[PDB]
Amino acid sequence: MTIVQAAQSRYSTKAFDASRKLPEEKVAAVKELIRMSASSVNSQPWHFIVASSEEGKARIAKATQGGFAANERKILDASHVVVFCAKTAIDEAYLLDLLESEDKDGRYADVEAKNGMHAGRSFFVNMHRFDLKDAHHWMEKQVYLNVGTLLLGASAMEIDAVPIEGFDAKVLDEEFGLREKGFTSVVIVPLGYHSEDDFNAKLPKSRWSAETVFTEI
Amino acid sequence: MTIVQAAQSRYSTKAFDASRKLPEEKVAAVKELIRMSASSVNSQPWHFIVASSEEGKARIAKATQGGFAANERKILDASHVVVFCAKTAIDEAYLLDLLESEDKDGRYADVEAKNGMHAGRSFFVNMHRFDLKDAHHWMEKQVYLNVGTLLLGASAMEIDAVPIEGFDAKVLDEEFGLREKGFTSVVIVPLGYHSEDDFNAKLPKSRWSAETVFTEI
Ligand SMILES: Cc1cc2nc3c(=O)[nH]c(=O)nc-3n(C[C@H](O)[C@H](O)[C@H](O)COP(=O)(O)O)c2cc1C
Ligand SMILES: Cc1cc2nc3c(=O)[nH]c(=O)nc-3n(C[C@H](O)[C@H](O)[C@H](O)COP(=O)(O)O)c2cc1C
């Protein structure tokens, strides 16, 4: 299957088959894929909650009650659920921890290259913190880029998924103590195999035409 | 090559081989991949500029001058460059045009299902416009999700890429009249084949460990 066929055949699963679980190899591949995502200045401004148990899924589904109840069964019936969380703030200590992990990983030949990268990344993060004043939105954008990798990657691995914004992030954040750890939930992605009765598995994919969305130069 | 190997082997290209051009089949596959991206409520709040000519690339590179000059040669030497643009605002007319494209595409059995989807999508877009007051950030997040699909997809198609935030979006917007058309440039992605002298092609990829970024439940 080509990556284009993966993009054409994936869809938002509206009903999972609660009997069908992902093999351990597919779960380990999902986790490696999202840890490896690109991010502006290698900020990696993310944390991931992975639920593989009925108790874990029930805890996440506390955030899909009332007006969000249409998403509850997607969480409960999926095999595995990934909660994508973004950093709520960014500071020099996080940037120094990041620079040290890259130094340990062999990215800097000398202290000159290391100091240079810090000064560059610092200039840039501070532009988002203090000049655009949008650092939380900028970090959540990197987390959405990560989600995109998972939606395409899941399809290429023949895994059904649905991205979910329709949840109460205060309830989910409190469920896992995320705000006191500097994180906030932004997207829920349940993973598994769609049920035969998934209405959306039998609808055509709808997108703007290429002549609408492309300007060629 | 598995999708995990695609995530492990891709990297941010810092120097392209200006002699090496993408085959027409690879360019058409990139364009189909990004048109097919998922987005919240199928908002597809995007437009794409694709430059395949020296003149096109020179026009985009006007936005990588002065403090952004470190990105100029990535644009000039790449085979093809994709500018990802987000909508600057969203209203009922865009939502009615979207609902009509989905109706034409066969997503609604009856006017009941159509009216239901409009009322649901409208409630939700209006929550971003008027309650969170973050509609432009919410739309740009969908465009970043799209970029993620391209970074992973390019790697699976054996195409080098680099995502670029380091550009002057006012200069790029004015270059293509985007703001008067309701769009703004958010990410530049040059595509092609890295040059042998790309320093970053010989550095290890650096990410947080799985024990840092995962909570298992
Ligand atoms: C949104 C975004 C914007 C980026 N902007 C730039 C840029 O302006 N110039 C640059 O050289 N690299 C840029 N990068 C590349 C990142 O530094 C890179 O993705 C990160 O260090 C992870 O390394 P990798 O892409 O080699 O795996 C950007 C990446 C992302 C995700
Ligand atoms: C950020 C994001 C959030 C989403 N939130 C929900 C949700 O809460 N519930 C839902 O059923 N679908 C949700 N979707 C699925 C979209 O409606 C779907 O991606 C879009 O209609 C395109 O269709 P496709 O994913 O079938 O190709 C979401 C998608 C994205 C990208």
Author numbering:
A (entry chain A), B (entry chain A): 1 to 217
What does the published report state?
This results in the formation of a reduced nitroso intermediate, which subsequently undergoes further reduction to generate the final hydroxylamine or amine product(s). Instead, active site amino acid residues act to stabilise the charge on the reduced form of the flavin mononucleotide (FMN) cofactor and form binding pockets that position the substrate, NADPH and FMN at optimal distances for efficient hydride transfer. Each dimer has two active sites, formed at this interface and comprised of residues from both monomers.
To better understand the improved enzymatic mechanism of NTR 2.0, we have now crystallised and solved the structure of NTR 2.0 to 1.85 Angstrom resolution. The asymmetric unit contained two NTR 2.0 molecules, with a Matthews coefficient of 2.32 Å3/Da and a solvent content of 47%. The structure of NTR 2.0 is a homodimer, with each monomer composed of 14 α-helices and 4 β-sheets (with connecting turns and loops). In both our wild-type and mutant structures, one FMN and one acetate molecule occupy each active site. In the NTR 2.0 structure, mutation of active site residue 108 from phenylalanine to tyrosine introduces hydrogen bonding from the Y108 hydroxyl group to nearby residue E102. Notably, the NTR 2.0 structure also exhibits a widened substrate entrance channel compared to the wild-type, resulting from the displacement of residues F123, F124 and F68 and the removal of the aromatic side chain at residue F70.
